[PDB]
Amino acid sequence: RNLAALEAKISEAKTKKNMLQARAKAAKANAELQQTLGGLGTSSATSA
Amino acid sequence: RNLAALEAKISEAKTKKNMLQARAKAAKANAELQQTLGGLGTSSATSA
């Protein structure tokens, strides 16, 4: 029974952590998209 | 939507700046024409 419980713990923790990391990476990618959209170099063209 | 907006910005800024530069060059060419018309070397012929 301890082995059954431990395997359940291992599987759930591993998969949950992996998916959490993947979604966090997706979120940070989206945040980088937002930064790039905000990060517009209009100043240089205006100076030219 | 951000990409659509950004492409619109890029196209409009590029074309407007290019045409502005071209027309400024035309204007300076015309100003050089006016200078050449004013810049008459009558003094040298008068001295001869």
- Measured in degrees and rounded to the nearest 5, phi and psi for residue A41 equal -85, 45
Contact criterion met (CB below 8 Å) for A45 and B14: no
Contact criterion met (CB below 8 Å) for A45 and B13: yes
User: How far does A21 lie from chain B, in Å, by closest CA?
Assistant: 26
Number of Cβ atoms within 10 Å of the Cβ of B6: 13
Q: How far apart are the first and last CA of chain A?
A: 73
| Contact criterion met (CB < 8 Å) for A48 and B17 | yes
| Beta strand extents in B1-48 (DSSP E only) | none
Query: From the centroid of its chain, how far is CA B48?
Result: 38
Task: Quote the crossing angle between the two packed helices A2-38 and B2-38, to the nearest 10°.
Answer: 20
State the method. Answer: cryo-EM
CA Rg, chain A, in Å? 22
Those residues whose C-beta lies under 8 Å from the C-beta of residue B9, and which sit 6 or more positions away, are A40
List the resolution, Å.
6.7
| Contact criterion met (CB < 8 Å) for B2 and A37 | yes
